[PDB]
């Protein structure tokens, strides 16, 4: 039932805020936490993400963390910034300097217990807490280093709850900072061991979509983040709205993750169409379905045609006949059955929800668990070793007390993870 | 007076259960508040419907039923439905966290904490019985609760209620009818450990029920409500012997007596006819010969398989409505000649026939048209092994890679339980092959 | 487009058909254990029929009829002809035969042996089974069935066959029949004669068995065109009048008999199958059924056309893609 | 084709038409299997909490 949400660092707080902004609009909540909705379908499951305060006020079950105040003020002074519980702001002053070691071991060490206190206070207010969700980037210092420290501490207090993260991978196409492959590799190591489900949101993929597909010549984080919030709303539809699915996070993990370490998901969203003459066409289910599976629509920069899907979850939203959706989804599998492993029968599932996202008559959200995600970890691995071969920029991390061995076993873990994906790409029945 | 207690486990069992009790009430004249004006014995009585309903001093007729689910969503419906006033709160049992489509979680982790409470509520009902003959248990194969908890319950029921009969109504998984990818695991796990603890199991393939709805009822995308109201007709005609004055199958033990020669091969096939659509205004009335015939066409069976390539060990024809014996023998005379009905050489080639003069009831506003006569055929044929072979193959594909296996091991089940269940299924398949082969 | 999988590697005929399918650019082969297939060219034995027709959204068709083995097993054919009322134990085109176990008919066979030996009649019998690729004494045949741990059929040996001249040689006739998913019975216009180069001597196991395995004309095979001219010149008759009417009639009676048992009308998957019928022709131009083959090979010359015919009426009939070498044997 | 065992009642009748002649564990056991599963679970939890303490 209840989910506790944590956003850490600049990126995590940025996309975390847009997420609450978007789903608040869907559930008919205004920026002061009052309900102004029509359908009651919007309150059926409102308690999943919102706490009910005195006076018919719904407040997000959200914890906001950062090692510097800047983004705290930014969120607090924005649209839907007043909706958040004021106790649930936990920030420092030092900042992490895009340094994983500062977030994970030195500066974050002091703030971490304050966060666990708010986490603990929210968990005890839950009827039956099902688990946690974290938004953060892997390329920085706070969301990457301190976000993973939070995951580790939270898992130790709630060892049987589901742990789920929306994790933004770094790309040289978007960001300037040379040490990002270092931060990401240390983070991936923590994620393979302490999360149950991780959505891989690749800034490299988000950039190609905005630049190539959407024709945005000067992409901003606001553009990228509006893709992320749309996808985050889509993948959480079946938690926040009733209908045909009696599903929570654990059931999703059980049916999406056939092997413990292989829990990194490839997300996608339809529709995506550049401005503007095509923005007025009516979307048909056949078109939604082809777009959803198109490699160029994927939100992790990896070619799904290079590998195989272990499992797929697809969710459609809006007014549409389920018969059309059924036929179309079966068409994709029957006509391209070599891209789905045959040792997992009937391994693509569909859910349809009546309420559509704001601004769209229809939409589809894609959750793919594909062996091709290895391309993402290979890319980060290449950048890592090019630098680590010569111990370049290592002093920023050893000056915080870290050893070289810790880097060696992080790259080691990621290389094995790559190997594991490769072995089911060639596994046959 | 011999009573029967129904236990409904998991979403499927509770929703199918809700459909059955609604149908029973329409069939006996019991209203949604528990009163039946046609009952002249207030507070008691030794009538046939009393094997499924107890009576309160106030004149209310309570179902002899128990509802269990490990999460309250589905049972809350029953708690607020048309027939909420007919149940006691003590008959509705809900947890807070479900089995997550995970057998090991339903059987071992969550099951351990709730089994004694369920047994205590069942015990309360058995105490109100003077001649309790056994249990009818409804549950899916694929659910974590339906597979995992039902198994624990069956094992327990043998202990506390040894020698009492246990009958099963089981929903066989079908991708058509929304299936999780691990339902093949749950199905083999629960069949293996329940096999020794039920005396007769009525399997319903969601794929078969789905096609009847689309083909005969003209329903583009059947809902659970469509599936569940059709399943209710079959259950109602199977149990109609226990709830009505009759002579065929008056006691649960007669089901195995009449239908299960071999203990392990206790899965009779159900065929039902006619399924006519209520929208259809014409309503051409079929003869007993026509509907008897339909029982031998594959498209009317509860499991998709081909009985022409198997052997029968028992066959029962259960008619409802406007049916005279003279017509039945005449139909069997014909059916024999124009049909391939091979019995095993150790059993006699014959048919047990029951006739209930009361015709099938329909839920007002359902999808089925009211008919003058209907048949439900129960046959123990080896053709049903086809459903086990399908299921075992899907199991093997995943198990060869140990896919999803860690979810069950992490709940405290040991990996060995998998291959022990699979070997049992291999044996069950050898059993069917031996009973109906000749080369 | 459409998808198919190959599960019998050895099939010379379906090895060919799958090449025509690929040649259309509208079919694709997908491994063996992948279940999202439109067509399954299945294996000879233990074909998992129970797995077909269950994949959502896939019209599945298979190249074998579940149940047609009853017609294609020596032992079961003899039992089917005698027990089925539409064929009768007096069926005038099947040689007298009995099933003998090394249900048994060894007591009934000996009764029909002394009834003939006493009657002073030709009593040459052939004995065979379904595990192999002729005598006048019962004491010599029954001890043979015992030295072989397999069930055998003892069938009356056709003592007075029709012989070809020049050569005074024996032969049999092979007909190819195709049954589609609608149970149309299609007879392939072209047949083959399995000739024996060795002259026939009714008093040596080469001039009696005519199949190509044991062995004038190339490949000991004569085609209908030639055999037709021979009947015209030698006997003043035609192939259609004196032989093909009986062949057409035998083929209908056998397949019409088992249709209620094997028909896939109203089944969740569809079936078709190519059969081989083996016939004998005696001195009086009477045709005898020898055996029915469920997995026949084809004459090397006739692999095309017949295989192209299989895709035309059997496969493309249910999966249409963007003359007639068959004779529709009208039935029902 | 013979008819036998004809029973006639108020709400129907029954009979048999013949065509051709013919030619457990204890409560202890269960609770030991359940407690054993609880053992393996607790052992796994200890391996996780131990690895996290490191
Ligand atoms: C989505 C957030 C983003 O706005 C994305 C880009 C970068 N930054 C901020 C804004 C920005 C951009 N360019 C800037 C130049 C000066 C100051 C600021 C900018 C941005 C753009 O043009 O649209 C707004 C941009 C940036 C780049 C950018 C594209 C881009 O917008 C299209 N490139 C992908 C890289 C780049 O390194 C590259 O690989 O070549 C294409 C690229 O190189 C060249 C020769 O263009 C370039 C351009 C300054 C060079 C050196 C540093 N790298 C980092 C990323 C890259 C840039 C957009 C963050
Ligand atoms: C589905 C498995 C795995 C790859 C395959 C095989 C998928 C199949 C289907 O996916 C929508 C494509 C579909 O059948 C079409 C051909 C009609 C189509 O939509 O293809 C895309 C081009 C796409 O480029 C990426 C293609 O290469 C691709 O992704 O193919 C536009 C256009 O091309 C002509 C065409 O309209 C992706 O999950
Ligand atoms: C493609 C879209 C809609 C659409 C497709 S066909 C139709 C009638 N409408 C949606 C997609 C939404 O998921 C959200 C992400 C889109 C990002 C945009 C905000 C983007 O930054 C911007 C440049 C745009 O593309 C538009 C503002 C033109 C946007 O309205 C169209 C779009 O992509 O939104
Ligand atoms: N016919 C029918 N099948 C159902 C129904 N509900 C679920 N099923 C089927 O049962 C399987 C899922 O089992 P459920 O009963 O939903 O699960 P559960 O017993 O609640 O188990 P958990 O939720 O995992 O604890 C799937 O194959 C569904 O298609 C129903 O009302 N009718
Ligand atoms: N009843 C019979 N009378 C006379 N000759 C017979 C006969 N049955 C079989 N033969 C001869 O034996 C040959 C083999 O026929 P049989 O039915 O045994 O085939 P087979 O299964 O052994 C090999 P194939 O499948 O290639 O025909 C025939 O071609 C014929 O020459
Ligand atoms: C709460 O949200 C979801 C929860 C689940 C699923 C899912 O995808 C449809 C969701 O997101 C829409 C789901 C996913 C994948 C499956 O197989 C890969 C499966 O068998 C099964 C499922 C779900 N069950 C069904 C029948 O779809 C249960 C878990
Ligand atoms: N998609 C997206 N990525 C962001 C955003 N802000 C920062 N990033 C990325 O996050 C990484 C830097 O981490 P950041 O969150 O700034 O650092 P932190 O505050 O120390 O956690 C780089 O790869 C940035 O491109 C944002 O709003 N959206
Ligand atoms: Ca009474
Ligand atoms: Mg920053
Ligand atoms: Mg449930």
Author numbering:
A (entry chain B): 2 to 42, 45 to 360, 369 to 440
B (entry chain A): 1 to 439
C (entry chain F): 1 to 102, 125 to 155, 162 to 231, 235 to 246, 256 to 362, 372 to 381
D (entry chain E): 6 to 28, 44 to 74
From the paper:
Here, we describe a multi-reservoir, high viscosity extruder as a step towards automation of sample delivery at XFELs. After commissioning the device with lysozyme crystals, we collected time-resolved data using crystals of a membrane-bound, light-driven sodium pump. Static data were also collected from the soluble protein tubulin that was soaked with a series of small molecule drugs. In two commissioning beamtimes at the SwissFEL Alvra endstation, we validated the general performance of the multi-reservoir extruder and determined 13 structures overall.
Due to its key role during cell division, tubulin is a classical target for anti-cancer therapeutics including drugs such as Taxol and Vince alkaloids. We tested such an approach using the multi-reservoir extruder by collecting data from tubulin crystals incubated with a cocktail of five drugs, each targeting different binding sites, with known binding behaviour. All five drugs included in the mixture could be resolved in their respective binding sites. B Tubulin/Drug cocktail screening: Binding pockets and crystal structures of known anti-tubulin drugs Epothilone A, Peloruside, Ansamitocin P3, Vinblastine, and Colchicine. Additionally, such cocktail approaches facilitate the exploration of allosteric and global effects whereby simultaneous ligand mixing might influence affinity levels at different binding sites as compared to mixing with single compounds.
